């Protein structure tokens, strides 16, 4: 019985939480409780995304960023080495 009242309250609150209601009904004693609780779950989902986003931000280690300069020394030297290996294979 109350489920619909709560569900409707839920759906209505989210709908309003979506930004689809009037600022008057918020004064409803039931309205305000959901207002905080609705915004609570909203910030909760914001966190549900942001915590995961921040998790790898540090996990995106600059080790490869350090590896970037390695190509500069690696590149020309490996080019010379490959040319020498090609000449040796040819002979």
């Amino acid at each position: 019985e109350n489920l619909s009242r709560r569900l409707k309250v839920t759906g209505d609150l989210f709908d309003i939480m979506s930004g689809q209601t009037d600022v008057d009904h918020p004064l409803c004693e039931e309205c305000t409780d959901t207002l905080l609780d609705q915004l609570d779950t909203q910030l909760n989902v914001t966190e549900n995304e942001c915590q995961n986003y921040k998790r790898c931000l540090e996990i995106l280690e600059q080790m490869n960023e350090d590896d970037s300069e390695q190509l500069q020394m690696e590149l020309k030297e490996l080019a010379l080495e490959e040319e020498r290996l090609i000449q040796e294979l040819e002979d």
Binding site: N2, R6, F14, M17, D33, E49
Partner: protein, 390 residues
């Protein structure tokens, strides 16, 4: 009125005859399968800024299907497989003949007494150039149509996202206040142990209805229900699942994909190029008409226009115009390839959203479970409180 449809999956021109206009709903699918190279099982089509077509409603129900407001089509396997949208362009026999003729005309030398054949070839070239300019205009239209299919894809994403957000955020926020409601549920679980004790102490008209309700909600089943409800109800099970749902949403939320480059910004240049091609075709037609007037002038030139080199000048002008037109034919073929190019470029963000969709489809199975769980919670609160009062 014949059906107008572009495979938003390709955003490409594959129209329908009015013959399928009033046929069954699956008739459009079978038409895409047979007439178009788009099978049924791995395929999709929906209404832009509207719902995905059901099995009954006609197109106009969501008014669309026109050459400027058609329906958007999606091949399920298209993104299901990597499938950078294939542009295996049909036999260029027309384009191949155009290339051969243009090469011959460039290699064609000045015409002395061959003016009639030269004018015939120039007229054929002008007509073919106009036909190709029209085909390329339809191609630029089909590019704008891929843009419209992308708008339809964004609308469908927004729609499905709204449904998923409704269900998910509903269960979630409901649990959000359910936290204190969770303390109430804990008190109810204490009362539940009490009620188990009472039922042990109460072996066995409204009582008849309550007992009937007891038949399909056996005691062990209800105890297991409460236990699992709490366990999976582990608040982290939501808050971690909360991060999970937010991640599914984000997976949907690829902002850069839609704002690729201001697709209208480049479509404007595409339309300007199509306009330049049409102007080139009109100039070629004007030159062919001048060639006819010059054939007339050469015929009348026996007496009053005895200046020389007329046939040579005509042949040279024909060759120059042919080279100019072939030049634009280059950009035309470049756009023909850019068809598949932008097709894969879109298929990228397509697959992005689609994988977000499949992951959030698992998430939505979880969200139906979450509904069921919150329902169990509240409805059981009421009814099982009654049944446990004993």
């Amino acid at each position: 009125m014949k059906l107008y449809v572009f495979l938003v999956n390709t955003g490409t021109t594959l129209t329908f005859d009015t013959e399928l206009t009033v046929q069954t709903v699956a008739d459009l699918k079978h038409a895409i399968q047979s007439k178009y190279k788009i099978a049924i099982q791995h395929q999709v089509l929906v209404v832009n800024g509207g719902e995905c077509m059901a099995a009954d409603r006609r197109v106009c129900t969501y008014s669309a299907g026109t050459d400027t407001n058609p329906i958007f089509l999606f091949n399920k396997e298209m993104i299901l497989c990597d499938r950078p949208p294939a542009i295996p362009k049909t036999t260029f026999s027309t384009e191949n003949d155009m290339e051969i003729k243009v090469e011959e005309s460039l290699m064609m030398p000045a015409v002395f007494h061959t003016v009639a054949s030269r004018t015939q070839l120039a007229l054929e070239m002008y007509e073919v150039a106009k036909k190709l300019c029209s085909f390329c205009e339809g191609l630029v239209h089909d590019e704008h149509l891929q843009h419209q299919g992308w708008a339809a894809i964004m609308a469908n994403l927004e729609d499905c996202s709204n449904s998923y957000q409704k269900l998910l955020f509903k269960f979630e926020s409901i649990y959000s206040n359910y936290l204190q409601s969770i303390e109430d549920i804990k008190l109810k679980l204490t009362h539940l142990g009490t009620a188990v004790s009472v039922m042990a102490k109460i072996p066995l008209s409204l009582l008849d209805w309550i007992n009937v309700q007891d038949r399909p909600n056996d005691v062990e089943s209800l105890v297991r229900k409460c236990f699992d409800s709490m366990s999976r109800l582990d608040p982290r099970i939501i808050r971690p699942f909360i991060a999970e749902c937010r991640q599914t949403i984000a997976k949907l939320d690829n902002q850069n994909m839609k704002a690729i480059k201001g697709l209208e910004d480049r479509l404007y240049a595409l339309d300007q190029m199509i306009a330049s091609c049409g102007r080139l075709v009109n100039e070629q037609k004007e030159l062919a008409q001048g060639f006819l007037a010059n054939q007339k002038r050469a015929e009348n030139l026996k007496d009053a226009s005895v200046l020389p080199d007329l046939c040579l000048s005509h042949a040279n002008q024909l060759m120059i115009m042919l080279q100019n037109h072939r030049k634009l034919l280059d950009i035309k073929q470049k756009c023909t390839t850019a068809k598949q190019e932008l097709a894969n470029n879109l298929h990228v963000r397509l697959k992005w959203c689609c994988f977000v969709m499949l992951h959030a489809d698992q998430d939505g199975e979880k969200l139906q479970a979450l509904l069921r769980l919150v329902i169990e919670l509240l409805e059981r609160v009421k009814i099982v409180e009654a049944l446990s009062t004993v």
